[PDB]
Symmetry: C3
Subunit: 382 residues, 3 copies
């Protein structure tokens, strides 16, 4: 039993301060979220900040809202050894860079880290699905950290540490072949920095077919938009057709842009939920259910999240300031049907049927289907 009668424009619910930045998490107990099995997290990493490496029981999609940095994402059995510059030496994983507009992927059980190499704050919008095929435990999100001693808030409910602090000193000294002084550091008993630490002194690093697929796609301003309306705005899709790895995690996203008074035509997604996060501006959004009842009718403002349930019809209209968002989909290929427009449910319908449907005349029925010239996004024609 899913309670989708009162959707709400959600704001983060908890905060966790770290040495080099902070972490905000949404209410996983929200009825919409609970029903779809989603979690939202926003990381704000200050310059020279490093988000320690950890892995989760659920696939993640991460949207870079601001800044640029480098990440390290392993991936099981994937040979990735690399030899640094002047090579004494070191062998490491590929150093992957990213910038604003980047939609990064993180498969379940895969550890990763991120570092802000820029001077502005690195803001990351993390979307996790717990009802994903990949997670065999429960609809509850878990992050397993490799270093540090982080206050587990990615889900909350406790002196939580990293995966090593639960192990016996002896055991760890053997496995790694090290002294107890090292087991102390490993366990990070005293680390009071949390999950985003300050990178000390200097950071020089800045250079089975599965092992070859791209782990990101930029759906930002500096890329073509699949749906484009010069006067209205646009939507840039990132599904498995454009990013193969998406078929694996079974997630996808849409980055949308609306100009002043621009409106997204009524529609619903037939095969997935749509966890919308507003990245800029604000808009009036209306969602309706199968009862023909309004389950949401208000404003979504920058920094907020509105979970649009699968099949629920919706309509969006940006404020004078315009509206910009990143919509995560719980399917590798979200299909959106239009109710009004060049290609609509309406257009598909015979005039004879539309007539009897709305007790209108074949002529009025005509103004009904052909009256709308545009497509997905509508240019200020209020």
């Amino acid at each position: 039993a899913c309670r989708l009668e009162n959707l709400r424009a959600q704001d983060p619910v908890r905060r966790a301060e770290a040495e080099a930045g902070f972490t905000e998490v949404w209410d996983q107990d929200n009825d919409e979220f609970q029903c779809a099995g989603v979690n939202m997290i926003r990381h704000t990493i200050r310059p020279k900040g490093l988000l320690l490496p950890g892995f989760s029981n659920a696939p993640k999609l991460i949207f870079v809202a601001q800044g640029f940095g480098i990440r390290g994402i392993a991936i099981p059995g994937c040979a990735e050894t690399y030899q640094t510059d002047l090579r004494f030496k070191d062998q490491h994983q590929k150093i992957r860079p990213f910038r604003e507009g980047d939609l990064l992927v993180v498969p379940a059980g895969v550890s990763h880290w991120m570092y802000n190499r820029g001077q502005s704050d690195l803001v990351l919008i993390v979307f996790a699905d717990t009802r994903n095929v990949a997670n065999q435990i429960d609809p509850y999100l878990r992050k397993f950290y490799l270093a540090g001693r982080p206050e587990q808030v990615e889900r909350g409910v406790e002196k939580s540490g990293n995966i090593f602090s639960g192990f016996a000193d002896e055991f760890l000294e053997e496995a790694f072949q090290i002294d107890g002084g090292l087991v102390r550091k490993l366990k990070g008993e005293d680390d009071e920095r949390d999950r985003i630490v300050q990178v000390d002194e200097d950071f020089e690093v800045l250079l089975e077919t599965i092992c070859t697929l791209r782990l990101k796609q930029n759906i930002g301003r500096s890329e073509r938009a699949d749906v484009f309306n010069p006067r209205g705005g646009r939507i840039s899709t990132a599904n498995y057709h454009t990013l193969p790895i998406l078929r694996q995690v079974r997630l996808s996203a849409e980055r949308g842009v609306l100009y002043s008074n621009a409106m997204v035509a009524p529609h619903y997604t037939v095969n997935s939920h749509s966890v919308m996060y507003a990245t800029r501006g604000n808009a009036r959004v209306q969602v309706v259910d199968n009862f023909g009842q309004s389950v949401f009718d208000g404003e979504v403002r920058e920094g907020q999240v509105l979970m649009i349930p699968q099949n629920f019809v919706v309509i969006k209209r940006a404020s004078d300031r315009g509206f910009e968002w990143i919509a995560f989909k719980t399917n590798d290929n979200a299909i959106t049907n239009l109710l009004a427009g060049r290609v609509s449910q309406m257009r598909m319908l015979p005039l004879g049927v539309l007539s009897n449907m709305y007790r209108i005349s074949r002529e009025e029925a005509q103004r009904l289907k052909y009256g709308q010239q545009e497509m997905r996004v509508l240019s200020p024609g209020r």
Copy 2:
């Protein structure tokens, strides 16, 4: 915890009168149904009747028990524009006709409508699966109508309307580029016809590889039967091998016919449930569980539904009047193992094993496996 100790021959539980016909729905809270995540609906559309277009969160299979008509089933991204006869003009979807014996398909999130073009009553047996991969909400069925103001009984639990009545007048006037008088019709505020309306005056319409697959298969009298016994009756299968689109919705069906005193040999389906709906006559049916206990032993009469749980052994015997049914399967390819017959679990067994199994002799064991000459259906050999 599924309560499958007391199956029952179910009758519809609710009724909804419409202008041009009515709608009956079974008890979705029935223990069998609840466990399998199934819903049953029977539409009775009178001549000149139109079942307004709507879409559901779950895949549907529809069996035409009586009559013939035309449907309009869109399907996302599937170009389907068509230009009517003397073309002023109109562009619409393919006009798909159907007759008795037709097993129609309706993928989740796809809207469709049906119209009775015949003079007899058009009777439709709708089977919906909510525990289908395609539905990401909950095991509760939802139908989203595009026009009218229908009393939501496809699940019941309220002034329920169509998807537009939950939207603001302004919003709808823009999206469609219409006057408020039209928004009034669209919202169908006063429509008191329910879901099956009377087609007014005259109805002339009567003419990505996914977009090319068949959306129906006739498993009626005018088609060969995969399993046939001249003296007993037969069973016509409709799985993904015969109808590709079935692999998508992950449903399939079997239309069966039994002559007087004909019996379907004991058997169980290894990979799915079997939601049997009797279309004619009646029969004595016995189901047994893994405890060797009878979980059903009685009569299934025309118009009733018996949900045979996966792996449950069953036996059927038609009355003197014979027995005819349409069995929906919750898998694209239901596999049925036989207990007695030419190809049986018994036949596969070595006489030495059968002996020790039933403390009988190799000779008696012989009369046990080879004693049954026939196959699936058995001709009156009572």
Copy 3:
């Protein structure tokens, strides 16, 4: 909500004596098991013993811990008729033999039987997954027997019989074309032998592409090991790459061997649970969760089961007597990431990152990643 805070080294919880041996079952209500949807059963079949044929609603993997015998596993629609030796005659299924080290497969809904043809006791470790795609009922295990009258303990909660005892005498006499005296034997009303009966007098039997795939793989001593450490021990994998049929049931296993004081390096499986059953010796095992808390820290002794949750880090160290186990995986291909070793999460990490991670120096960070020479299993380097 999965309770994985207190894993435990489980022992069977119930016993069922049969004529020719006995059956032990683990507590399916155990929190770990319940969360992963697993069941454990151990059959001990004495010489000349036959485990009557039955089928389950869930896929099974069976490990032969001791002895050797022959089985009969049908498989739906798979033509398998075979004509015995001096042929009066008999047509039966393929007679499949097996020995110690054999990991047998039993798809859901498929009946099978086993017979001990050796002189030692035939010990079978049966692993069943109820949360497997193949089972459409509930997370509760069910076995449907064809003969005998077994006390249903494979799940317990009753005069439980075989699938025929729930059917009317008349019905069974027709289906099979037999006398009521035979229906009496079939129903096994008086059979008081339970599920493992004594094979009487003499047992001579001892000779769609799906129908051609292997139904077993030996991961015992007389086979190469994918992971091998001369001084430590090894692990023999059985996934879909080595046994195709595994991709169907979506299960796999690992047979491991540890020499005195040998240790399995820290690690976690990213895509499945690991239901470990100790076949010999004992070891100290430590599991840690995402909170960095120890959710298990003790001894696993021969005959016991420890369910290692997905993503949970673990470490194993054999006693002086060594440790040997069979680990069932709830996925057709369990991927294990290493924390310390030649190919580790550690090795993948840049020295610069490891430094800031454990507030250690680039040199100490060096001894951290390259300090461990070995791989999965570690030779006594305590």
